[model samples]
Target: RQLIRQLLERDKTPLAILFMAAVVGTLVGLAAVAFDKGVAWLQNQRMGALVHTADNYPLLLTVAFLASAVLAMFGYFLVRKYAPEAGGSGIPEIEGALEDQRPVRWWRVLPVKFFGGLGTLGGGMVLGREGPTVQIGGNIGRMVLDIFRLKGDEARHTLLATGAAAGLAAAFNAPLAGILFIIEEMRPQFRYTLISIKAVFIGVIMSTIMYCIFNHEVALIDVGKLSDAPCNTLWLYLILGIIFGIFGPIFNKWVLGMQDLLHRVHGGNITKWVLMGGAIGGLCGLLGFVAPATSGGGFNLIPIATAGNFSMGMLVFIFVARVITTLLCFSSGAPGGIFAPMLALGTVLGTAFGMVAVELFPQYHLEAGTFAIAGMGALLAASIRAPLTGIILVLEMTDNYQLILPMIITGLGATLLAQFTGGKPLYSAILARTLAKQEAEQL
Candidate 1:
């Protein structure tokens, strides 16, 4: 504690923080690059093996099932056995730790989540890499603390937040979004001082630079600059938000419900956990072969869905199927994230709504893809309850600079309605539950 005071009392100049932020950004960028490559390599290995066995029919099926099952089982077993806190989305866990309500067991979580995530996510589970990246980035923040022997509480807290922001920036190549995420989503935990905010900004800048150096500065989703949402069409966005507002809480409830059901089925038995994970993994493998849309992170599916290739019926069917698969994969305690899957689900449903609207009205001269863009952020805003962050993140990734107003409106509508309906932010709620469990165990 004294170390914390000493660090805080020292000359913490703006320049110094800015410099540190740069360092934080660079490190996070490198980490993000490495993480992306690592996950891709693992995925290729799995894919290659599966492809090799495809010609053998029964052998192919068995190999696919067993491989995914074993991979998922490894992920689940590691989390359950070592760091139960690392399970599901780790973003909320980082938030909890920042508030001092939860511990940062980085030593256990880093390896457990990294390799384990590779297993589950590589096994064709419906998960995102962003959540794990954020968690790992936060842990790296703490690791930085121990390495520097920085004794000051303020320094530790500030750098941890900085690292997290850097992590997000690195993950999506969206520096502004990363800064906004820390300021908005983590408002409760973050110390909103001039120094802290600057630190976050610096961190984001540094991370972005590193990211650009390693990976080409390309947007994650190139939905090509779409038409702007005109004032007249703004109402359509609100309606879209209202639709997501209803579905967002419903989605969150279903996720938690599935988690409970999975727990009951496994009954804390390792064998049962492994078998269930294997079954889910194998099914996803099979689905990848049959209906590829229903498998994998929905990143590749977003543009295809928006391109108007699928009929309305097919869009809805894929959405429903994804929802089920998402629940099953995430609820089984896999070391993966729900962010990408959630975004995909939002896109699927949003596109479906837009298609139907175009069919009904035909006079508005509306493009369904616009709604797809707006819906992308709206569902995130509704479920995560971070409107600003959602808006900024989407804008950064999609480069839809002209659609800011509609995005804001849609995001605000989703947030206000979801909150009014007593819907809690999904990650925060998950962290709270985790803390409760931890407290109970300590007792």
Candidate 2:
């Protein structure tokens, strides 16, 4: 009886926390898998509709616009009408919750983010899957606590982090990256402990297992094995990093500024916000039919771009266009994420730079794919300021462990430059803005 009581003790027992972590991980994995399939299923349906009307341009355009607009409006309306906190990337909200400054309204958030993400992401918005997954995971952590009537700061905090890591791991199928994300990106809020860290590992492993069960086990991005970066080309990666460093801060600023602009345009009116979001989604749908290269979360575009499939000029054009699309969908608070889009952008930029280097040094036998890999992480490091997480994330996704040195150099260079340029971590900046609004609303 004494041993049972000790094991059951919620506050002090490490076993209980570990058990909860496993539970959170299992649930998170299921949720992440469901969300992924849901988003893809919806998207395929929409595309199927578009394909049916392909021969008739006018009908196709009309169907595409109307379909995407309606889908996007559904998402925007859900977020604006029901849960405002479910808007945008949702990472900031998780961050705020970790610091105990924000409430995890899982009841509202789970439904809003899941369905809303479906609408937006399915509507061909340039948003990522990871953001909503992470938020959902954290909310699930809270939901588990509430369901079981578990109470304790450690239990709450540990489970929340565990769910979050599991969510990320399941999203990318990169367990180590997921664990590092919480440890590195969320270091400020995460309370590290032996038990807590072990729980995170458990959660990530379970989450990854869940992902593998549903989907084929493969790296998220299949760039194929590329040649190693020569010592001579190491400097090129640093230069690429520097380029991202400059662009990273600028991109963050643009995102924030665009958010302000969109806020002014909508003027806090739900109707206006939803309609505006619909229009953007409509445009994205139209772009999907027209350019096709500059739409969606950009994951499908990565391998194509990295393989030198597109000419340098085309790559540049797609990159610029995607930057605009990313800002529009993400800045408009469309209940999606920028992570995948950012990675896509990095791939394009890196590939283009690699192409240019190829011309400059014919004897070097430089492979653009190598730069593509390094550039992928550099942008994440510079923008999110999580160098280790960025490096491991790309490494895991591409399965290119040999390029670790280049990845490290590029990530460090990008991070140093982004910091020097006075750019705050994107999520933190968003959180600060959110907190400011919350404070003002209280008045």
What's the C-alpha lDDT at position 411 in model 2? 92
Model 2 misplaced regions, further than 4 Å: 1-12
Q: Who wins the TM-score comparison? A: 2
Candidate 2 TM-score, C-alpha based: 0.96
Model 2 CA lDDT for position 69: 90
- lDDT comparing candidate 2 with the true structure: 0.89
Per-candidate TM equals: 0.93, 0.96
Which residue pairs collide in model 1, if any? Answer: 3-151, 3-152, 4-151, 4-152, 4-153, 25-207, 69-278
Query: lDDT per residue, candidate 2, 64-149, as tens digits?
Result: 89899999999999998779899988789899988899999999999999999999999998999889999999899888889878
Count of backbone clashes for each model? 7, 0
Assess each prediction's global lDDT (C-alpha) against the native.
Answer: 0.80, 0.89
Write the residue-wise lDDT of candidate 1 on 258-330 in tens digits. Answer: 8888888778887787788888877887776678899887777877776677788899799889988999888
The positional error of residue 104 in candidate 2, measured at the CA in angstroms, is 0.5
Q: What value of lDDT does candidate 1 attain over all alpha carbons? A: 0.80
Off by over 4 Å in 1: 1-20, 53-55
